[PDB]
Each structure stands twice: as C-alpha cells, then as structure tokens.
Design an enzyme around this catalytic site. Structure first.
Site, short mmCIF file in Angstrom:
data_model
loop_
_atom_site.label_atom_id
_atom_site.label_comp_id
_atom_site.label_asym_id
_atom_site.label_seq_id
_atom_site.Cartn_x
_atom_site.Cartn_y
_atom_site.Cartn_z
CG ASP A 1 -1.97 1.07 1.15
OD1 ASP A 1 -1.87 1.95 0.26
OD2 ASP A 1 -2.85 0.96 2.03
CB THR A 2 2.03 3.35 -2.82
OG1 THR A 2 0.81 3.50 -3.53
CG2 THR A 2 2.83 2.24 -3.47
N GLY A 3 -0.22 4.20 -0.42
CA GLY A 3 -0.94 5.27 0.27
C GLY A 3 -0.85 5.22 1.78
C1 LIG Z 1 -3.54 12.59 6.35
O1 LIG Z 1 -3.93 11.32 6.92
C2 LIG Z 1 -2.87 10.46 6.86
O2 LIG Z 1 -1.91 10.91 6.21
N1 LIG Z 1 -2.92 9.24 7.41
C3 LIG Z 1 -1.78 8.34 7.48
C4 LIG Z 1 -1.24 7.80 6.16
O3 LIG Z 1 -0.64 6.55 6.50
C5 LIG Z 1 -1.04 6.12 7.79
C6 LIG Z 1 -1.70 4.75 7.76
C7 LIG Z 1 -3.14 4.96 7.28
O4 LIG Z 1 -3.02 5.04 5.83
C8 LIG Z 1 -4.22 4.87 5.20
O5 LIG Z 1 -5.30 4.66 5.79
N2 LIG Z 1 -4.15 4.91 3.87
C9 LIG Z 1 -5.23 4.86 2.91
C10 LIG Z 1 -5.31 6.16 2.08
C11 LIG Z 1 -5.50 7.33 3.06
C12 LIG Z 1 -4.38 8.09 3.40
C13 LIG Z 1 -4.48 9.16 4.28
C14 LIG Z 1 -5.72 9.47 4.82
C15 LIG Z 1 -6.84 8.73 4.49
C16 LIG Z 1 -6.74 7.64 3.61
C17 LIG Z 1 -5.11 3.62 2.03
O6 LIG Z 1 -3.91 3.75 1.26
C18 LIG Z 1 -6.34 3.27 1.19
N3 LIG Z 1 -7.45 2.83 2.03
C19 LIG Z 1 -7.72 1.40 2.03
C20 LIG Z 1 -6.80 0.62 2.98
C21 LIG Z 1 -6.98 1.04 4.45
C22 LIG Z 1 -7.11 -0.88 2.83
S1 LIG Z 1 -8.79 3.79 2.11
O7 LIG Z 1 -8.33 5.17 1.86
O8 LIG Z 1 -9.41 3.51 3.42
C23 LIG Z 1 -9.85 3.33 0.80
C24 LIG Z 1 -10.94 2.51 0.96
C25 LIG Z 1 -11.81 2.13 -0.05
C26 LIG Z 1 -11.53 2.62 -1.33
O9 LIG Z 1 -12.25 2.37 -2.44
C27 LIG Z 1 -13.30 1.46 -2.18
C28 LIG Z 1 -10.44 3.45 -1.52
C29 LIG Z 1 -9.61 3.80 -0.48
C30 LIG Z 1 -3.45 6.36 7.83
C31 LIG Z 1 -2.15 7.05 8.21
#
Ligand SMILES: COC(=O)N[C@@H]1CO[C@@H]2C[C@H](OC(=O)N[C@@H](Cc3ccccc3)[C@H](O)CN(CC(C)C)S(=O)(=O)c3ccc(OC)cc3)C[C@H]12
Ligand SMILES: [Cl-]
Ligand SMILES: [Cl-]
Ligand SMILES: [Cl-]
Ligand SMILES: [Cl-]
Ligand code: NA
Ligand code: NA
Lengths: 99, 99
Positions: free
Chosen positions: B25-27
């Site tokens: 997960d690059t996000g």
């Molecule tokens: C500014 O907030 C942050 O930077 N948070 C941090 C970034 O990294 C830390 C770990 C967590 O990262 C994330 O939750 N990342 C999110 C994508 C993401 C990233 C950031 C915020 C919300 C969502 C994911 O990359 C994509 N997510 C799915 C995974 C949890 C399975 S998602 O955003 O919930 C999602 C869910 C369903 C979807 O389509 C159906 C599309 C995206 C949260 C923190």
C-alpha cells in the site's frame, strides 16, 4: 517515471477543470476525491477503511489527467482526508509496483 | 517482480513465524496489522484513515518477511480491516511505483 517511496507519492491531477494534488494509492480499490462538483449523474455509496465508513457520491465515466496521463473511470466524491488515486485509474496509466 | 494493479496487490508476509496475507500500500505511511502478539514494548500512536482516527500499538524493530524480502522495522497493531504494508517497509524491500 520511477517514483520511490521515501515520501508520499503525490502527483498533480486535473479533474472537473480543477488542479488538485492526489496520492497514488495501490491500497485503494477506487479513486476518492474531496468534495467538488462533477457533471452528470451519480449515486450514493459507502466506502470503508481505517476508522470506518464514509458516504460518497459515485460518478461514472469521469476523465482525469494524472501526472500528464489521461484516464477515464469512476470517481468517488466525499469527505476523504486526502485525494486518492486508486487502482481503477492506476491501471489505466500503466502503473506497476516493482521490487 | 512487477506487480500490476488489476487485482489487489496482496502478498504473503511472515511475522512471528506465522504467514499472513497483506496489501502492498503506497498510500499508507505505516505498516498496520490486525491484532496479534509481538514481542517487546509498544508505544501509542493514532493514525487517521478514510473514516477517521484509530488507536494502534506501535512496535519497533520487528522482523518481518514481505513477499520473500527481509525487513526489520516498525509495525502498528490495531483494528485495521486488512493487513497493510506501508512505505516504511516498502522502502526496505526496494519497492518503487513505475509508469
Ligand atoms: C492525512 O492522513 C494520513 O496521512 N494518514 C496516514 C497515512 O498513513 C497512515 C496509515 C493509514 O493510511 C491509510 O489509511 N491509507 C489509505 C489512504 C489514506 C491516506 C491518508 C488518509 C486517508 C486515507 C489507504 O492507502 C487506502 N485505504 C484502504 C486501505 C486502508 C485498505 S482507504 O483510503 O481507506 C480506501 C478505501 C476504499 C476505497 O475504495 C473502495 C479506496 C480507499 C493512515 C495514516
Ligand atoms: Cl511525505
Ligand atoms: Cl472505473
Ligand atoms: Cl497491464
Ligand atoms: Cl520502520
Ligand atoms: Na457519469
Ligand atoms: Na521493539
């Protein structure tokens, strides 16, 4: 390009005539953008992730430009903390994970 | 390898002698795994995903194998809906995004 992952893989997108910054997100099935208006029909959807679910508007057949590359597909609009380019559009620009 | 994104980029990981499935997960800045026991002390952390913020347990310097590649780094444990390999360990295995 080759994007390393020392920092967040943010790119500029063009959507609905607007420029935005968005995260290239291999962990996202779909593309989710902060509140904005888009033309055409939509329907409500719930999407879930860490923290739980949010309600979004699903717009189909929307053209985006992602770092210079055009795609078309479904875009979800709603109260996401970050603009996310998910796999439904990453595939269209030929993005791959390599190691 | 080169992983395309038509399907979720799921791989096998090994942590504490146990095989698990996880998402590349690059996000995600951080690696987040479902409830399991890990050795040593933990520290508190809050992470904010698409539905809001959750509390996790932060374990540092954990040995983890990802798709056959050996990493040692921070693992967050908490109520994530899927195990996610974030950038902190994607960088250790040499992963890039390419298009
Ligand atoms: C500014 O907030 C942050 O930077 N948070 C941090 C970034 O990294 C830390 C770990 C967590 O990262 C994330 O939750 N990342 C999110 C994508 C993401 C990233 C950031 C915020 C919300 C969502 C994911 O990359 C994509 N997510 C799915 C995974 C949890 C399975 S998602 O955003 O919930 C999602 C869910 C369903 C979807 O389509 C159906 C599309 C995206 C949260 C923190
Ligand atoms: Cl960053
Ligand atoms: Cl689509
Ligand atoms: Cl392809
Ligand atoms: Cl780490
Ligand atoms: Na439409
Ligand atoms: Na530790």
């Amino acid at each position: 390009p080759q994007i390393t992952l020392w920092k967040r893989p943010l790119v500029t997108i063009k959507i609905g005539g607007q420029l935005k910054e968005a995260l290239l997100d291999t962990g996202a099935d779909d593309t989710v953008i902060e509140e904005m208006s888009l033309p055409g029909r939509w329907k409500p959807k719930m999407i879930g992730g860490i923290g739980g679910f949010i309600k979004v508007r699903q717009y189909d057949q929307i053209i985006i430009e992602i770092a210079g590359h055009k795609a078309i597909g479904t875009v979800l609009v709603g109260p996401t903390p970050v603009n996310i380019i998910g796999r439904n559009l990453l595939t269209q620009i030929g993005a791959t994970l390599n190691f």
